[PDB]
């Protein structure tokens, strides 16, 4: 109809109750489900969907072999029905790649997916399901992108993307797209030494993405964006309570403009709902592994340093897998504020679990209740045992 | 369009012509399948549909192993078209959990879903696909509802949820929602001692629920609604032709304000369509366990408690396994009457054909016709040796 | 929109062209395919689709040990996009049942499944996706319909059901329905001696049904309908050119008011498109069983006693199994005329084709042709060999 | 809505984007994926969707056996959702038969399959999902088509059809058809000597059609079409760089109008976009087999024949089969210009891998870029041994 415009304010999360689950590898040990990893959920004005990258097999089938690899030919961002397994039948390719962001406008929407060699990706951005723009590796180093969905605001979608070194200073850079075509570029500025994989969201014309410094920082980078003026800033999460993982032990204080240090070179996609005291920060338990998942109330851990938990709610027992983690609302919801959304990807197979030969995931999501409700641990639910 | 009102009365019930079958388990022996069990039919204004709680899983799939379980993080509430199986790739996700209930207003449809450990569930209340509100358990014990539709009037569509013991007094409450959101709440009032799983249907602006008293009755607690005033009363059919299951064998009078006794903690989901002569009974045949399945004619059983039968139609041999039972019907039909529905649950697996390690069930459903109609009998049509 | 009026006359039939085949067989063999016979084919305004009374299994399972049988409580009329094959996941119930028919009035669709035991069958009519009428067996023994579609006129649709012996006098009626409820029913009259599983079409406000003397005759009785007066009247097709099967050899002379003898209690459902000299007959080749099947242009042959072929098609080759054939025009196509088209069901498996335990079959539909066509044979495709 | 017409001329092409991928052959390997072989692409006004000849039968089913031949009586034309693989229940049957053509003239879609044994073929004319006009075999040797989208400009549809020889003259003709309807046909005049499976797109009210000269010609011929004058020209494409297949090494001068001699009764269906300067050439690497596929600038290549590579793009690798090409278009995205856009078969199997009894493909399918993009190679992806 219009576009949509970021008129509310964030609902007050008092808690987290369950919205999607899918059980994609336990329904996959017996039916067509296709591999995937990297998923997240985006919302239409009529719809919520869940989206990942396929990469183009089945779980059960032999070419299932191998799927640990992050790119190949085979991948392609792929969307489907709410809380339904990603199968070869229901599964609906939005572009092929591997790396991926997608969002709606109010209008139609637009999807991102950037595939290519190492030294000469490249991404396309669709529009109203039909290729618009290209964008060719600036870098020559992996051109990546988001992992989960961009945010709009008056037909104003900004998406992050990273080209060059992972482990080193990369070239950041926020683009500003209109109706798929680009409206403006900007290199990163701001704090934040190193981004990757931004998990974003919006409210009162203002979009925050909480992203992931795999260099250096075990404190995630925060890239704020002005959709309307279409410029942006960037600093850490002040806060303690480390998010990033491996990460070390937390200590008493954070750091706001430098990366936390104590781990190098490595980390997960993750997010967080920044709004003062109504703040919440999403990460896995363990330090060590993608294990566990938990959200914790740290009000204002953004801006201060030595902001610890206030309340919390367990998603997934350490004693379960977990992996990447992404913001998302729906921003065509009726009411009178915008309901806090994640998604935590339960990653099984590979390197974890190598008794199989595949890597895949389910995926499970929450939204924000305004109520204290009672918590459940959400697991992905398979026996490795029965692939064998 | 324009929220639906009980503005008509019952047809005359002279038989029951068949309406519904999807031989899911059946068709389940090779082809994608998923486990369920409390399964119900609802209608939208222009579809009616298949529903159920999945077991997240395939029949044949290996995690169909222990699906005799009645609450997992892996179950969820899915509809799919009338009377085909439900299948991995057409089955709609409506929510997540573990106890449901769902009902179209006329303008959209609320679903409802409880999810959570024993002592700490919550209800998620989704309308027009989208979570409205909350509800967390109030009792900590099993918080619980329906397992059938709730029935609307004027956007006021109430729901009878049930927290506490299965064996002793519990907290019954009646929520009157209104596009998700909670106009108002009672507690349980009336003469019954025990409520759970509510069977419902509307007519004349008012809301009648057969139910179940776990606890103690052999007699159906009947629960009936006034959405207008949104106030209600309960007591049990005063019949002694006894309804739930196990049971003792028929009395020749009932009990109107008390369960009739014989039978302790145990009983079954059924209904049935209190309306003076025009009054049916649903039972199983036998009085031991979920076997066979009929419908019996007591003139004025609810207010009558030497009410006999006058006319019966079987449904399923008592030489084969029936399960729950419910009321919907269509309330978007055209004609001067609401036609009288209800669907069986044919369990099959666990535990009583043990040879197999899961449980699941297929659906026959039925509706009234004002001619007298020869009758089938209707079987679940699976082999178990297949399976084997 | 509003409902169809026959006013157009027949298109010239010169040739047969291909319109639609599912090759379900073969493709079942290896994917989740229903097991049915009974098919047929029936247009909307918007789309023409394939219809059949599943078996409630798939060919490959083990259920399907046994569906040579023709009534049990596990069949239903299913639909399914032209030329795909029934599978559990893109087949739509239209209702339950062992012997059906179904037709579009221009506004909606009216579907009709008969089930029950031998001796107390009962048909319920749908409309608009709903019940709206139930009639009871009359004679007892095998209430039994068309197994193809029905056609409308101003909202009136006309169906023929046969209740009693089939191998001696029954009770043939013609009920005038009209938005699912009976406006009236006749009595066979006429010249036929016995009635089943008609085969009908359209053209300039009357309505012909080529049916089967199950009884006596290896001609085929026509019921002629006026679905304005709703009247009707019967024969026998004169022609010395015989459509049943088994049958005698053809003789020089036929018969117009008796059947034509020397085959008794069998025969196959079949039709014809009697239009003066734009006359068509269908037929199997083999005179002893449903093997082969060729169309010929016999002109007159409803009225002409000795009337003889004048050019011919063949359809499916002798060495290949046929089976059933009914009529379907798309009345809602372009154009100044209907063009005639039929489907022949292709049997596979018991009772010929013994080494497997199942019997099911696929379809094959042509459409008239004003051109001359070149012919080809049209096999169902299947090796049996594989299912072994 | 009305008749698109051919208002834009062609973007400039500065490199290829990816723009589907179905990866069929790797997904069915463990999923109900139908055999097929001659892909294509089309889009509708409001979606683009893979086109492909269905074997009928899956490619793990027994009845895969045999499928390298072109010709049976289970074949038809699907088409299924973009990217998708064609699988049994997401391929929408177009028409039945062995040969075939599609496109939307922006009102609806006319769709062309030819069927029948060689020396009595016939072509079926579908319009709007109907059967309209029927053309019989004029040569008695394999009718044949496209293979490929036709083009269509105020309602007029000009298909290519060459009926006779493989390897000396045929008949070829032009039909122009509006609503499935013949308007004109005309005999093929100009000088390409023989004509097979072209590759057509529109731009500024011309069709342009780059063919395969399967008897002598190892350059291609190219008919242009004038759709309103319905009037066409033919000449071979002038250029040295050869791009049939098999072929012989290139020269440094090509023929205008004369087949380009070496390699005589065999080729491949290929296209070219032929614009001036923006001018690109599709060939396969390799000179012997259908093997790898690369594009290439060569500016003038219709009129110059001395024209020679200016830029180029690889595909698919020469260590990776390819077969067939073709050009399709979305007229109806945004913009001021029309985007090339073409698709590769990648066929599995037989005769290159026969350890199969099996022959297949997937499609892999690009559109232009006005950018300088970076390459990938795209194969089929599935490892044969795992079929074994
Ligand atoms: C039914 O449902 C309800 C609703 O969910 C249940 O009630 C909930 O129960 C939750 C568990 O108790 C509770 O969550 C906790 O909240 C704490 C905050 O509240 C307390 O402190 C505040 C502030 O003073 C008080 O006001 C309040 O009254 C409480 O006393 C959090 O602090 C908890 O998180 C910390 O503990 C968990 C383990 O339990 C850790 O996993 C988590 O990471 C937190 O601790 C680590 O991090 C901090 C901060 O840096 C460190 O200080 C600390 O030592 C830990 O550090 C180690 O571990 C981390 C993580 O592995 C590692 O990275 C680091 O290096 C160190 O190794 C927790 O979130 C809910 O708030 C509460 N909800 C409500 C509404 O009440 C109820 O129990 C259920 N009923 C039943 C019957 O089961
Ligand atoms: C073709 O189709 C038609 C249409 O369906 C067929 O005709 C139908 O046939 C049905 C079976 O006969 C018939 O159903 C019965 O109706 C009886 C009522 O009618 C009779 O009584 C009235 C009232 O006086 C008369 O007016 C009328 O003329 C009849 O004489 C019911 O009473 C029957 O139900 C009872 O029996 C069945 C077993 O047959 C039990 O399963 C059922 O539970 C009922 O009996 C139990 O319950 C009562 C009440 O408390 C007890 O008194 C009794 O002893 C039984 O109790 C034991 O069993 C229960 C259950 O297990 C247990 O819990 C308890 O503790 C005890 O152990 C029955 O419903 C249809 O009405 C009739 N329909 C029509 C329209 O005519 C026709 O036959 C078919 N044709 C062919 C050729 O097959
Ligand atoms: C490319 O395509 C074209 C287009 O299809 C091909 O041309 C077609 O070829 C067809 C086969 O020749 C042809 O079909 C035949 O038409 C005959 C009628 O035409 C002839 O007679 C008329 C009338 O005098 C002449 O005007 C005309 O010029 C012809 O001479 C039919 O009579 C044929 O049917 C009979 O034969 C077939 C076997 O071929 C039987 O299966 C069929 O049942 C008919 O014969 C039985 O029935 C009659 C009637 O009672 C009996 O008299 C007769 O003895 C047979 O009876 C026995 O068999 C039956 C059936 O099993 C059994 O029940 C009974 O008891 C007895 O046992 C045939 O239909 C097309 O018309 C023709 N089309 C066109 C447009 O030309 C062309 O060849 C193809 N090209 C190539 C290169 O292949
Ligand atoms: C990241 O991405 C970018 C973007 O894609 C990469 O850059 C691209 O790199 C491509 C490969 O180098 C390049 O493609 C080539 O373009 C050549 C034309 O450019 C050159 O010449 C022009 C004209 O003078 C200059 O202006 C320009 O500066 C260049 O110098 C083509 O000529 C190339 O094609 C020929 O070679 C390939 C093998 O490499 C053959 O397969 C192809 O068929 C061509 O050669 C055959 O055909 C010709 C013509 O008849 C014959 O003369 C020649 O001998 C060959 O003939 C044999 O082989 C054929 C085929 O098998 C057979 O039939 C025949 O009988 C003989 O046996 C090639 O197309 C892109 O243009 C370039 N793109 C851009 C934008 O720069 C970049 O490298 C990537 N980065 C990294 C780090 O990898
Ligand atoms: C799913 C799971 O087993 N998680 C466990 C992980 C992994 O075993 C290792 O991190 C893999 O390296 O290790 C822990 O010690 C941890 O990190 O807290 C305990 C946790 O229960
Ligand atoms: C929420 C829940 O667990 N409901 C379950 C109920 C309760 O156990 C009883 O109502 C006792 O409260 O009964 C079942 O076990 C049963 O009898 O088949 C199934 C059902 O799933
Ligand atoms: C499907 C079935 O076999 N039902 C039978 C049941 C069960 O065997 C037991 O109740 C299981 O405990 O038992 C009966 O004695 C009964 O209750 O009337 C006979 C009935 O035919
Ligand atoms: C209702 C019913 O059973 N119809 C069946 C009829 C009747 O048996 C005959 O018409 C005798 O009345 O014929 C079949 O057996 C047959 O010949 O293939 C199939 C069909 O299902
Ligand atoms: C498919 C098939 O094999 N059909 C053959 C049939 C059957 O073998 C028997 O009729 C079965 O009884 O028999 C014929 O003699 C015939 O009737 O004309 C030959 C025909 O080719
Ligand atoms: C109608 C038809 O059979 N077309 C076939 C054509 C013809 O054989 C050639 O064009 C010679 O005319 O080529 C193929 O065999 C091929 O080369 O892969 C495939 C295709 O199906
Ligand atoms: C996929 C593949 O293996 N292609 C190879 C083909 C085939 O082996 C033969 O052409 C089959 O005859 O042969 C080459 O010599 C060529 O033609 O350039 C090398 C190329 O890498
Ligand atoms: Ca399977
Ligand atoms: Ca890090
Ligand atoms: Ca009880
Ligand atoms: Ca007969
Ligand atoms: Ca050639």
């Known amino acids: 109809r219009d576009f949509n415009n970021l008129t509310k304010g964030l609902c007050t999360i008092n808690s987290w109750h369950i919205y999607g689950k899918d059980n994609a590898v336990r329904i996959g040990e017996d039916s067509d489900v296709l591999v995937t990893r990297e998923p997240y959920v985006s919302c239409d004005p009529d719809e919520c969907r869940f989206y990942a990258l396929s990469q183009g097999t089945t779980i059960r089938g032999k070419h299932s072999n191998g799927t640990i690899h992050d790119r190949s030919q085979y991948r392609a961002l792929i969307s489907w029905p709410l809380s339904s397994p990603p199968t070869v039948y229901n599964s609906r390719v939005e572009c092929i790649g591997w790396s991926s962001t997608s969002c709606h406008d109010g209008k139609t929407r637009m999807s991102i997916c950037i595939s290519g060699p190492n030294n000469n990706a490249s991404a396309v951005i669709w529009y109203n399901r039909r290729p618009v723009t290209e964008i060719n590796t600036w870098a020559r180093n992996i051109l990546r992108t988001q992992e989960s969905e961009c945010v709009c605001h008056n037909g104003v979608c900004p998406v992050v993307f990273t080209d060059g070194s992972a482990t080193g200073p990369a070239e950041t850079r926020i683009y500003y797209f209109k109706e798929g075509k680009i409206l403006k570029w900007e290199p990163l500025a701001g704090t934040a030494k190193h981004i990757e994989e931004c998990s974003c969201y919006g409210?009162?014309?203002?979009?925050?993405?909480?992203?992931?410094?795999?260099?250096?920082?075990?404190?995630?980078?925060?890239?704020r964006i002005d959709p309307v003026a279409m410029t942006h800033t960037s600093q850490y999460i002040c806060s303690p309570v480390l998010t990033d993982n491996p990460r070390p032990n937390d200590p008493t204080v954070g750091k706001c403009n430098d990366p936390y240090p104590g781990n190098n070179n490595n980390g997960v996609k993750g997010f967080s709902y920044l709004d003062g005291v109504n703040t919440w920060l999403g990460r896995t338990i363990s330090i060590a592994s993608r294990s566990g998942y938990e959200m914790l109330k740290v009000p204002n851990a953004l801006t201060d340093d030595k902001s610890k938990p206030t309340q919390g709610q367990t998603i997934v027992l350490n004693t379960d897998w977990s992996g990447y983690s992404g913001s998302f609302m729906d921003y065509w919801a009726e009411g009178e504020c915008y309901r806090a959304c994640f998604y935590v990807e339960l990653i099984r197979g590979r390197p974890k679990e190598d008794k199989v030969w595949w890597t895949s995931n389910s995926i499970v999501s929450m939204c924000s209740s305004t109520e204290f409700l009672g918590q459940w641990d959400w697991p992905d639910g398979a026996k490795i045992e029965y692939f064998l």
Do not use: H, L, M
């Open 203 to 223: 409210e009162r014309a203002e979009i925050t993405c909480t992203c992931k410094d795999n260099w250096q920082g075990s404190n995630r980078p925060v890239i």
